[PDB]
Amino acid sequence: LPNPSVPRAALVAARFLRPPGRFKRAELREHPRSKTGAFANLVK
Amino acid sequence: APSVHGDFCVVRRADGGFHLVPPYPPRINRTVEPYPPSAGNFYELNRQFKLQWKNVEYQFVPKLLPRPWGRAGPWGGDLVRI
Amino acid sequence: SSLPCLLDSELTAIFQGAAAKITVSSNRLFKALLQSGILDRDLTGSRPVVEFQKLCDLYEEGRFYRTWAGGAHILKISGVKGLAPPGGNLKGGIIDGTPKHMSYEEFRTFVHAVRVWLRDERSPVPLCDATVRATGS
Amino acid sequence: EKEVPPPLKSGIGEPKKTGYKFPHVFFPYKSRYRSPHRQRWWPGSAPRFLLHSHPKRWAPRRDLSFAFFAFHGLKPFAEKNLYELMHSLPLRGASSFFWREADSDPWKHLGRKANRLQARGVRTQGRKQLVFSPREIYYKRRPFHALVFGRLSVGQLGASSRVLKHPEIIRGLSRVAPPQASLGGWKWRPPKDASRWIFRPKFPLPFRPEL
Amino acid sequence: LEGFLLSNLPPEVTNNQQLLSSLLGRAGLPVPPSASILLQRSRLGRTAGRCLVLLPFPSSAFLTGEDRKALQTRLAAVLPAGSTVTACDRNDVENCIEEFERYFFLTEDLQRLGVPSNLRKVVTLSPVPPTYGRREVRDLLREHANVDVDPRDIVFRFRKDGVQGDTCYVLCRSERDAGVVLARIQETAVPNRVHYGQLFGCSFLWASRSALFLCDSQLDYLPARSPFQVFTTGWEGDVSEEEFKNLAYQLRLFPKAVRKFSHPGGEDVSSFFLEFHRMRDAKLTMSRLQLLRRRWRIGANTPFFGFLRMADLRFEDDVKFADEDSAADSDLDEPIDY
RNA sequence: GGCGAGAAGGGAAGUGUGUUUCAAAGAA
RNA sequence: GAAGUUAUGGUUUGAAAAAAAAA
RNA sequence: UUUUAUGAUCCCAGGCUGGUUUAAUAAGUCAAAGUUUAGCCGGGAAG
RNA sequence: GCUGUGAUGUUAAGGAGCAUAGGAAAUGCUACACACCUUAAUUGGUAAUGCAUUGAUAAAAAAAAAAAAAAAA
RNA sequence: AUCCCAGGCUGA
RNA sequence: AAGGGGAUGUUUAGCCGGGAAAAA
Q1: Nucleotides on strand H with an atom closer than 7 A to protein CB?
Q2: Distance between alpha carbon E282 and the CA centroid of its chain, in Å?
Q3: Alpha-carbon torsion E290, E295, E297, E298, what sign?
Q4: Which residues 25-64 in chain D show a CB within 8 A of chain A?
Q5: D153 to chain E, minimum CA–CA distance in Å?
Q6: Which member of C122, E1, E139, E274 lies 3.0 to 4.6 Å from E255 by CB, making a disulfide possible if both were Cys?
Q7: Are E5 and E88 in contact, with CB atoms under 8 Å apart?
Q8: Integer Cα distance of E49 and E13 in angstroms
């Protein structure tokens, strides 16, 4: 139910960050998935 | 009040940073047939998106909700633990 | 003193009794929960009996209908006509008033919330709404 | 005939992979999408390290031999990486000094983008390089994969080709993985206090190399 | 029920003793010319806007939920709009008193943390639930990391309204202990409150190195030199400013200026403050430093670099605090990009 | 290794789309 | 993000559900 | 118990919005509704 | 030593060409601008873009020395 | 469950 | 060349996190 935990500092610092486009979104869900961070598994 | 980030979420990155990602599982409109009609030749038309950690699973399929949507948003689901 | 937590075995027994994966109407769940007298035992451990009216008020105030997508069936049945609230479409229409059919985990969360709120109603220091904004000046 | 990406292959030291039945995640509805993990196969590009470099090598047993297993150590200068160079050196290259040239990288010479406008102009015409001395070595896949640490400092190249002169002009970092060890043109120099037992001098050549 | 916490009191009420006492008396609490009042004041003798009212407790020990409701409603009605009233039990009273003490003595604690020798021993924990104190942080570290730290070198970050922030700085007794804390405390579930004899609410704590402290006479006016300054450490001991300029150029780091920092003792590592022309250049250099960290394989939590920033200063003669001055225009030094 | 990348969509939706009138704070 | 927002053409062929009862 | 001649139940067809000049005592906003670079919007999938 | 095996399933929601139906619904470019992407940088790049052909469905194609202004009495 | 991790911590 | 062409030579073990395949 909840989203992955992230600091309020990151929440604030991402204020002007443009969200991903179509191709950039497609690059985040490929199988090599090298970009996934710590404690950031979509399924788990 | 509206949300600053909308439907995307800030999540940690493999390089020690952070970035915005779309929600999981995907918010899909299942009331309509897949488009194009030949989408099945290249995709799994009954693909499912699970939320399981070890032996515990959760059944969550986002779906549209009645208005006013407000802060919560258009999409929601039930609490179903296995 | 203390607030003991109910047993998953007892809650599952109540849930299955009300039913007789598995979703049971809030009406049946509330009736079974009130018959079991479990809330009365909790209150005695921590004056009158809990009412179906009190259960309905707590359900509404907790607003679990919105939280657990209780209105998705409206869009399933009516369709686009289900988006607008009553009166949004000046032509009129029928909007199902079915209360949510809770699963076991949803029922457990509701029961825990009800017990906590009932405890707070009497405890000198509550878990929730311990802070109230001043209005006068 | 058409030039197309080579088939995907698994690296040495790994189990096989099942693969996928279509090139990328948008095929064919978005033909101009490029995956970040796509293999770089076109001329003037360096294949990714441990993903598409060092593919599993298979040959018919008729042609198999012991030399077949020295391919990674015999890779040419432009391609051989730091670990492949180090494996067959005294003390696994430890206590020596290493520096990379970069003047023969494949992109600087080959490809469609090799010749392009630069912010400074075209070339018409001694150097302070980065020197790495290994201290801790551990190979995960001999000879091309290792987890190395060592001292990084600022050296002083000079006219012999170039030769390292003062490997320790400025002290840098005392323990770091080698920089650009994944690939490139590396040159090495044995330490000043070298022992003839470890760094064996060349065996004398025959006086009469009879046929 | 031990007392009430009043937050966001107006400066007039906080400063005027008679007005607050009269308000409490009208609400019902008899304030002697019994209930006791304690304001939150800093070392400058300025009220932070928070008050603690401890009820008389040879008799209030028999109060009940109805009494709590009535008293809280009366206090909310009497007190000015915009100020919140909360009920506090004994644990809440202890937390409030400790919070006031730490707020008053924050400066000395900050200096002690900033002693240069402790550069690599301070660990930042967030988000700490408000109910937690130094003892709770010590217990949490013992439980989830098997590390023992002094419960007197733990410093909470405070907010402009006097309420504790969700960030703690802990001075581990050793760099090994700091590294162990960093490795162990990651997404650790932690109870939020103890109520009715159970643990209610879960908060997921993380540890990192995101607030480095340095208190020295050589750096007091260093930050004023430029707004775009990057601290870096972990270099060899004997390198001077010119040698480090050459090394940075070799590493493809292009600082406008370099300033070496040296403190009595500890010459094994040399620290340097780099200065850049633009915030864009500072950020790109920090990104390259992150890349070099990853390629060099040093610890992700190892203290390698950071962004210099003087701590906010408050002076007795100031009428408007610089941090609270709405006219500031420092944001024009940091252009926004998508 | 890092950023950007929808042949610039008319394939869904009628009380919908959009329009008009408003509102939206970090460093709490 | 919220609150208000006349329907039109195809001529249209007024009651629809729930509940109760039934077996 | 909830909708319903203020059109419920229930078919088919259509995204909406703006564009300055504009003769005649018909204009001080082109005056019930006619647009043309544009504005807002228009799912998801390598399992 | 002697078949083969090692991720070895690749082309439409787009474009172009050719036909069908219809009264009819579309063609060339070396393109020094703007804008955008990138960068440490007027550091590098484009074909969205900008030009030209036809189309016959629109304009301009009258008046002022020293001025580029001037209800041109 | 042990294939990978230029991801980490621990063992008196 | 009696006698160094001798002798010594089992695999570090856990926890967390991320990724791929099989399965689901």
Answers
A1: 1-10, 43-47
A2: 25
A3: negative
A4: 25-26, 30, 33, 35-37, 51
A5: 8
A6: E274
A7: yes
A8: 9
